[PDB]
Amino acid sequence: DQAGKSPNAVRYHGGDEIILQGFHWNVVREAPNDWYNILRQQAATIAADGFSAIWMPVPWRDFSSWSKSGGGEGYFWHDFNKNGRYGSDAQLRQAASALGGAGVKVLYDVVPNHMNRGYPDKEINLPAGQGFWRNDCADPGNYPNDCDDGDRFIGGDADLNTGHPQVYGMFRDEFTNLRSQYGAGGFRFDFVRGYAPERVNSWMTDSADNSFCVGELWKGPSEYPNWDWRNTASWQQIIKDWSDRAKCPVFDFALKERMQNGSIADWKHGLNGNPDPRWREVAVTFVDNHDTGYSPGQNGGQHHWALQDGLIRQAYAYILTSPGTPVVYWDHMYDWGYGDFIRQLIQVRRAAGVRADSAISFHSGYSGLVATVSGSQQTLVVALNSDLGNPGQVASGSFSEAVNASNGQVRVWRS
Ligand SMILES: [Ca+2]
Ligand SMILES: [Ca+2]
Numbered sequence: 001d002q003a004g005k006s007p008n009a010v011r012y013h014g015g016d017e018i019i020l021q022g023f024h025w026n027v028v029r030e031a032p033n034d035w036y037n038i039l040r041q042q043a044a045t046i047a048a049d050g051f052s053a054i055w056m057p058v059p060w061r062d063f064s065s066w067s068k069s070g071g072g073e074g075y076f077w078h079d080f081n082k083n084g085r086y087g088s089d090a091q092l093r094q095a096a097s098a099l100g101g102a103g104v105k106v107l108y109d110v111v112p113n114h115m116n117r118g119y120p121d122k123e124i125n126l127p128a129g130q131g132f133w134r135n136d137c138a139d140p141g142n143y144p145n146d147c148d149d150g151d152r153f154i155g156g157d158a159d160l161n162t163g164h165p166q167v168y169g170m171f172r173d174e175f176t177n178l179r180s181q182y183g184a185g186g187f188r189f190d191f192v193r194g195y196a197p198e199r200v201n202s203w204m205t206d207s208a209d210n211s212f213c214v215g216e217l218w219k220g221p222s223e224y225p226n227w228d229w230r231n232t233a234s235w236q237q238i239i240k241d242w243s244d245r246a247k248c249p250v251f252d253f254a255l256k257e258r259m260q261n262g263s264i265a266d267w268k269h270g271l272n273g274n275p276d277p278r279w280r281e282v283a284v285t286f287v288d289n290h291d292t293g294y295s296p297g298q299n300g301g302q303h304h305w306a307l308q309d310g311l312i313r314q315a316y317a318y319i320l321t322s323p324g325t326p327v328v329y330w331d332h333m334y335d336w337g338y339g340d341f342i343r344q345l346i347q348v349r350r351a352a353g354v355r356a357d358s359a360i361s362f363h364s365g366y367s368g369l370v371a372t373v374s375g376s377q378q379t380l381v382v383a384l385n386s387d388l389g390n391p392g393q394v395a396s397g398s399f400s401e402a403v404n405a406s407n408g409q410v411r412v413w414r415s
Pocket of ligand 2: 113134148149150151152153159160193194195
């Protein structure tokens with residue numbers, strides 16, 4: 001495990017990570033209070049599967065509820081107290097210790113934008129009029145106000161002024177706490193549209209400068225004001241700009257949007273297919289998450305922007321063999337049976353020495369997606385839903401079949 005910063009000081013931790021998203025949306029309903037125990041017991045497996053890092057659920061306790069229903073998942077926490085719906089503080093430490101022990105870094109999901117303000121019994125009480133809240137200032141709309149330099153969450157009445165010295169300080173100390181007592185190797189920043197990118201850089205600088213970080217910025221061009229450059233920019237340029245300011249890798253929503261709206265050939269338009277390595281290397285690719293995808297149980301979870309089952313293998317084949325840093329959804333790996341297939345690809349990625357900044361070229365004369373990836377050990381030829389007949393039609397060298405699945409729809413060759 002190589003550990004540096006990118007040539008632009010982006011905290012990609014050597015560009016060699018392979019992340020497991022360690023939960024699904026309904027864990028709190030399906031394995032109530034038992035999730036950390038399950039992870040502790042799976043640690044050896046996760047490690048054996050080839051993951052270098054795991055994205056843990058929000059550790060901050062959440063006892064919210066709303067009604068079809070939800071609550072307690074962590075995105076509406078009331079405290080920094082770890083005795084929540086995923087398990088106890090003690091179980092968390094054991095889980096973290098087991099994962100860290102098996103060689104898997106622990107990335108914690110953190111939610112700095114808002115908190116369950118109205119929760120009666122909480123350890124954190126910030127009064128109104130004092131400037132701790134967004135709503136302490138005039139709230140025109142879902143736009144920055146003087147009390148909050150980002151967008152608001154729903155109504156914006158739970159929005160924190162993360163720029164308030166005492167609020168900034170509060171998060172900063174919790175981040176240090178997670179690192180010193182909960183074995184945090186990094187953080188996944190939730191709803192980065194809600195506060196300044198610069199703040200993420202400060203928090204990282206202050207608490208875990210050399211760790212891995214990733215921000216989730218899900219906001220399309222049409223969501224910015226008409227006069228904003230972003231209103232007419234590509235998905236790639238919007239997320240790249242955030243990454244440049246936060247100095248953290250960013251979820252590849254450009255690739256997700258093409259997976260959802262374009263054809264397989266169009267997948268070459270995510271951040272990760274960018275010809276500039278300074279662009280590609282900060283991309284954190286995924287297929288689905290707790291939000292966009294399905295989850296076992298209750299109403300199939302959230303499924304806000306789910307990838308159809310007929311493209312699941314193709315999607316994994318693509319992210320596991322290409323530039324950027326890939327993320328595997330718990331469910332595809334461990335619930336739905338794609339595990340064996342994902343394991344082979346992880347092995348293929350590792351054997352070829354594919355990293356965040358590896359070069360990728362797309363070949364125009366065949367159907368589907370055809371790409372050549374220059375891994376540091378080997379060259380891979382990837383043909384998805386293609387008529388390509390032999391790897392030699394697009395690349396020089398001697399190739400062996402590495403993967404052949406879904407009736408030739410997924411094919412990978414190594415040099
Ligand atoms: Ca690394
Ligand atoms: Ca906000």
